[PDB]
């Protein structure tokens, strides 16, 4: 199976920096930021740049102890950043791998948009547990959070 | 351990198609990219593209497009570029590699020396 | 499509010299970069991965820098065996690209 599942949301970070900020360095900003949410980021393979493996940790006591996603494509000018969650966690079984795709567009005031897709390969034809659905909202809800938060009381920072 | 295993010579009649295989060994072959770069006879080195084996993923430079075709064999865990109507410009010598925690380009195959010729 | 560009063509230097070469992006890739030495008759060898970084087994004369689009290796003093084309690669964007290769030369 293969179901998508967007969203959307906004925040007061210029897509630009926003961009910079939660997905360029966001992967060793989270365990700073989020805590409870990202214990530690480490690269599996590769260099951090398009193609890396990522091996994501999490506090003692979540859901998952681990899982790995794969820069697939980034998008540099139009801040549009795809990865793949591929080992560990939501994956297995029911689920084979996560595509997903996140693309920040600058509002008019100043502001901007995060829109998100989540295609869930599943095997052959079980469905996806709205379980799942659920917590990838709010674990990227949190996390873009922390962010806003962060990068507002550190007005220096990222440009 | 963690070696790519891969031939050492390739003779192919123009035109011909040649394969190039790639054996992995010492490392769980569909958590880690591959990455083919070729080189000619004392030349700058020349990525090719790369494939993450599991979901067979790939990414060609433009130059080989369709020249070149990367594909993979789970089972025998490992990975085969396959070149298609080759030519002298094609004649060179070709590396998989693989690369590891912080990098790329961490293990080098054998490198495999395609002559194309009659 | 990034473009690293290597200088000099070449150089040569005594055993026991000091040492420093050069790869310049056409654009920033900020630290996704990386150098190679691939002696005579052998397949490139990860020297430094990511700039100012020995990769296992590399000695200390070797070391790097730089971020943004200008890098250098550095042997603080070359051996004999230090002998070799050393190169330069880049993975900020796709596709990857790599430096021309700047030949290492021995007078004595």
């Known amino acids: 199976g293969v179901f998508n599942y967007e969203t959307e949301t906004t925040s007061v970070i210029p897509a630009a920096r926003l961009f910079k900020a939660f997905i360029l360095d966001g992967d060793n900003l989270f365990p700073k930021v989020a805590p409870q949410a990202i214990s530690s980021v480490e690269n599996i393979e590769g260099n951090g740049g398009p193609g890396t493996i990522k091996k994501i940790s999490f506090p003692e006591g979540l859901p998952f102890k681990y899982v790995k996603d794969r820069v697939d494509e980034v998008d540099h000018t139009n801040f549009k950043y795809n990865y793949s969650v591929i080992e560990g966690g939501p994956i297995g079984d029911t689920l084979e791998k996560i595509s997903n795709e996140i693309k920040i567009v600058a509002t008019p005031d100043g502001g901007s948009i995060l829109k998100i897709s989540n295609k869930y390969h599943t095997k052959g034809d079980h469905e996806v547990k709205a379980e799942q659905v659920k917590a990838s909202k709010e674990m990227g809800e949190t996390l873009l959070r922390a962010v806003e938060s962060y990068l507002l009381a550190h007005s220096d920072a990222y440009n | 351990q963690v070696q790519l295993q891969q031939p050492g010579t390739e003779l192919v009649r123009p035109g011909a198609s040649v394969i190039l295989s790639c054996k992995a060994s010492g490392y769980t072959f569909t958590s880690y990219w591959i990455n083919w770069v070729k080189q000619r006879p004392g030349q700058g080195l020349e990525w090719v593209g790369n494939?993450?084996?599991?979901?067979?993923?790939?990414n060609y430079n433009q130059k080989f497009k369709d020249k070149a075709t990367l594909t993979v064999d789970k089972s025998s865990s490992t990975a085969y570029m396959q070149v298609n109507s080759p030519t002298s410009e094609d004649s060179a010598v070709y590396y998989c590699?693989?690369?590891?925690?912080?990098?790329?380009?961490?293990?080098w195959g054998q490198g495999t020396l395609v002559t194309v010729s009659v | 499509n990034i473009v690293l560009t290597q200088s000099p063509k070449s150089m040569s230097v005594s055993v026991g010299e000091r040492v420093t070469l050069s790869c310049k992006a056409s654009?920033?890739?900020?630290?996704?970069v990386f150098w190679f030495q691939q002696k005579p008759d052998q397949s490139p060898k990860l020297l430094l991965y990511?700039?100012?970084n020995r990769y296992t087994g590399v000695p200390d004369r070797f070391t790097g820098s730089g971020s943004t689009t200008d890098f250098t290796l550095t042997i603080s003093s070359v051996q004999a065996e230090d002998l070799a084309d050393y190169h330069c690669?880049?993975?900020?964007?796709?596709?990857?690209?790599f430096g021309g290769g700047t030949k290492l030369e021995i007078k004595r």
């Open positions: 590699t693989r690369g590891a925690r912080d990098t790329w380009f961490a293990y």
């Open positions: 654009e920033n890739v900020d630290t996704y």
């Open positions: 494939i993450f084996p599991s979901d067979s993923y790939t």
């Open positions: 990511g700039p100012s």
């Open positions: 690669g880049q993975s900020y964007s796709y596709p990857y690209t």
